[PDB]
Amino acid sequence: ITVAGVRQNVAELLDYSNNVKKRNFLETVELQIGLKNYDPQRDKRFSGTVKLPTVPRPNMSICILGDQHDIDRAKHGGIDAMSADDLKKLNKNKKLIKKLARKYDAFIASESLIKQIPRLLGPGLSKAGKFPTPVSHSDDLSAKVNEVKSTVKFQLKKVLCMGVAVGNVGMTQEQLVANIMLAINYLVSLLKKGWQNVGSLTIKATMSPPKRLY
């Protein structure tokens, strides 16, 4: 992995996304990685979160669950909010939980409603992979939502493939290369063998062709 090669791949992906096959929407940029010489079903599953130098997923949507103070804090940043009464109105509906998980890409829950989310909303969010992150009342809800949007997760799944957003097509090439380098460094730090445990790596846009870097 080289910074110049990553910048060249990002420039090629941006040129393909902008000049040849420009889409009808702001296509985001992602990077896909593979694991090797490890057992995703028998060894310990690593996990972690790292905030990139740029916004990884600017098109991601976040839903806030909390009290009236949390709703006011979410409305201060313009994010949608869900009250405790709105959570209890679901009454453990799996279909409603799946619809909420399809509508909202990520969830942030306050400390008061974090324990009551599994009792009211049920395990639908955990089944869909959208478990809400905890949040305190003294922290800034808008800043927490922005940090959650700009950060990515590297938890090991049941398969050897993984991926993470590194920005968008409208972002700068240098910023995209820096985000990709930060994600690669986080993956190398999480891996026990470093680059020996990485199978391959590619970078692309949402609709542009991929470019292999490893």
* Residues that bind RNA in the complex, under the rule CB under 7 A: 21, 23-25, 27-30, 32, 57-60, 95, 98-99, 102-103, 105, 129, 152, 157-165, 168, 204-207
Q: Which residue has the tokens 């478990």?
A: 131
The least distance separating RNA from the CB of residue 67, rounded to whole angstroms, comes to: 27
User: Which ranges constitute the DSSP H helices of the chain?
Assistant: 3-15, 68-77, 84-90, 94-103, 111-114, 117-120, 124-128, 141-150, 173-190
The nearer residue to RNA, 92 or 98, going by C-beta atoms, is: 98
The nearer residue to RNA, 64 or 164, going by C-beta atoms, is: 164
Give CA–CA dist 93/214, Å, rounded. 44
What the block records as the tokens of 160 is: 């050897």
The least distance separating RNA from the CB of residue 208, rounded to whole angstroms, comes to: 9
The least distance separating RNA from the CB of residue 29, rounded to whole angstroms, comes to: 6
What the block records as the tokens of 192 is: 């026990």
Helix axes 3-15, 173-190, angle to 10 degrees: 130
The nearer residue to RNA, 78 or 129, going by C-beta atoms, is: 129
The least distance separating RNA from the CB of residue 156, rounded to whole angstroms, comes to: 10
The nearer residue to RNA, 44 or 158, going by C-beta atoms, is: 158
